[PDB]
Chains A and B, each alone.
Chain A
Amino acid sequence: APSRNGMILKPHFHKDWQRRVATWFNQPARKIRRRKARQARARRIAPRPASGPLRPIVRCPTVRYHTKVRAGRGFSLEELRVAGIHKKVARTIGISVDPRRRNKSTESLQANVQRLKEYRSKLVLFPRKPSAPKKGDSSAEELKLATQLTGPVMPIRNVFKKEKARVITEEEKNFKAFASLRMARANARLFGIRAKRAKEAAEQDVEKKK
C-alpha cells in the first residue's frame, strides 16, 4: 500500500529472477584473460600491427551522430579500384574490405582512397623468401623496423576547420533566419497540395477551350 507521496513505481521482480542473476566476479579474471590472449596474438602476427587491418573512415548515420566520424568495417570496392589495389590482394596486406558498402558522395570516396594511398606509402611489405624479388621493400626498411604498431593503425581523429573572423557583409546582417526556416517548413508542408490545385487550375483552363 502506498503512503503519502512517491513514484508509483513498477519493479520487474515477479518472474523467478534469482534463478537468472548474473554475477560479475569473473570480470578481473576475464579482463586478464583477454589481455593475455591479446598479447599472444600480437606475438603471433610478428611485425604486423597488433590492431588488425586498416579500416576506412566513415560517417555515422542519423541527424544525431551525423557530424562525427568513426572507423568503418572495411574499404569499398570503388575505393580499392581507384587506389589500384586488387581486392583479393588487399586482404593479404592488412586492408579491411567490405563489399556491401555503397558509395554515395565523392567526398567520402576520395578521402578513403587517400587513406589507402597513405597506407601503401608507410607499409613495409616483407618478401616471401629472404631472397628478395619485386614489391618487397629494402633490407634497410626492415632491419630498422620489424616493429609492431601499437594501437589502431593510422587512427581517425574527428577534426574541425577553424573559421577566421569575417566582417559581416550587409546581406548576412540582412538575412531573416527564423523567418526563412518558418517559410522553408511551410513550403515542404504545402508543396504537394499547391501542385494539386495548380493541376486543377490547368485542367480548368484546358476545359474552358473544349
Chain B
Amino acid sequence: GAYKYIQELWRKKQSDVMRFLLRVRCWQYRQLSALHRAPRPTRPDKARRLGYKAKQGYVIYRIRVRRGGRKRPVPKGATYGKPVHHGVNQLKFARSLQSVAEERAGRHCGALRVLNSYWVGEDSTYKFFEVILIDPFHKAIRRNPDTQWITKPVHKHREMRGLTSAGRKSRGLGKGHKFHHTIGGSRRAAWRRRNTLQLHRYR
C-alpha cells in the first residue's frame, strides 16, 4: 500500500527528492503567519499513525516555533545570587519545541482538543509543526465510540498538563532502572512520597 512507500521515502530525508521538497515547503511556510490552519495534513501517513482520521471534526494547525535554547529573562545579567545560578546564556528549556508548538495550538483553539503533533521541516531560525486537533462536540466525534474518550472533560488541555506524546517525554517516565524519579505518578509525586514523614500511630 502507498502509505508504506510514503513512509520509507520520508525516512530518506537526506535524499535528493525529500531535501528539495523540504527546502521548498520550509520556504513557503516561512512566508506565512506563525499559526495557520492547514486545509489537509502535509504528512497524511504520519497523521494516521498518530491518530488523525480523514473525517469531519479533525483539524490541523501548522504552527511555527522559534528555534534554539532559552536565555534567562533577567535584566542585563544580574541573576543576583550564588554563582551557581549566574548562568543566562547556555541553558535549556525542559519541554521540547514540538510541545511548545502543541501548547500554542492548544492555547489558540480553546474548544479544540489537542491530540498529537508531527514535524514538517526546520530552518535555522524556526521549526515547523502540525498539530492534529479535534472538536469534542461535533457529533461525528461524539457518536463514534472509539474517539469519544476525548470528549470527556479530563482530557481538556492535554498539551497544557504534559499529556500529548511530545510533552510526555519531558516528564521523564518509562518503566525500568533508567527512571525511578517518576516511580509514583510523576517526578513531583515521588519526591512527595520520599519526603513524607510517615508518622504512625504506635511507632
Contacts and interface: CB of A to CB of B under 8 A. Distances in A.
**Do A and B share a direct contact in the complex (Cβ within 8 angstroms)?**
yes
A21 B196 contact: yes
B197 interface: yes
Name A's interface SS: mixed
Given A20-B192, A21-B197, A24-B198, 13 more contacts: A15-B195, A17-B195, A17-B197, A20-B197, A22-B196, A22-B197, A22-B198, A22-B199, A23-B199, A24-B199, A24-B201, A25-B201, A27-B201
B152 interface: no
Contacts of A22: 196-199
B82 interface: no
B85 interface: no
Contacts of A24: 198-201
21 contacts: A15-B195, A17-B195, A17-B197, A20-B192, A20-B195, A20-B196, A20-B197, A21-B196, A21-B197, A21-B199, A22-B196, A22-B197, A22-B198, A22-B199, A23-B199, A24-B198, A24-B199, A24-B200, A24-B201, A25-B201, A27-B201
Nearest to B203: A24
Interface residues of B, number: 8
A106 to B, nearest CB: 30
A17 B195 CA distance: 7
Nearest to A18: B197
Interface string A163-175: 0000000000000
A146 to B, nearest CB: 36
A13 B196 CA distance: 11
Interface in A1-47: 15, 17, 20-25, 27
Contacts of B200: 24
Interface of A: 15, 17, 20-25, 27
Greatest chain A CB density within 10 A among B192, B197, B200, B201 is at B197
Nearest to A26: B201
Contacts of B192: 20
A22 B193 CA distance: 10
Nearest to A20: B196
Contacts of B201: 24-25, 27
B198 to A, nearest CB: 5
B107 to A, nearest CB: 33
A41 B192 CA distance: 32
A20 B195 CA distance: 7
Interface in B150-192: 192
Contacts of A21: 196-197, 199
A22 B199 CA distance: 6
Contacts of A25: 201
Contacts of B197: 17, 20-22
Contacts of B198: 22, 24
Contacts of A27: 201
Contacts of B199: 21-24
Interface string B13-55: 0000000000000000000000000000000000000000000
A20 B197 CA distance: 6
A198 to B, nearest CB: 38
A27 B200 CA distance: 9
B190 to A, nearest CB: 13
Nearest to A16: B195
A101 to B, nearest CB: 17
Contacts of A17: 195, 197
What 6 A-B pairs come out closest when comparing CB atoms? A22-B196, A21-B197, A24-B201, A20-B196, A22-B198, A24-B200
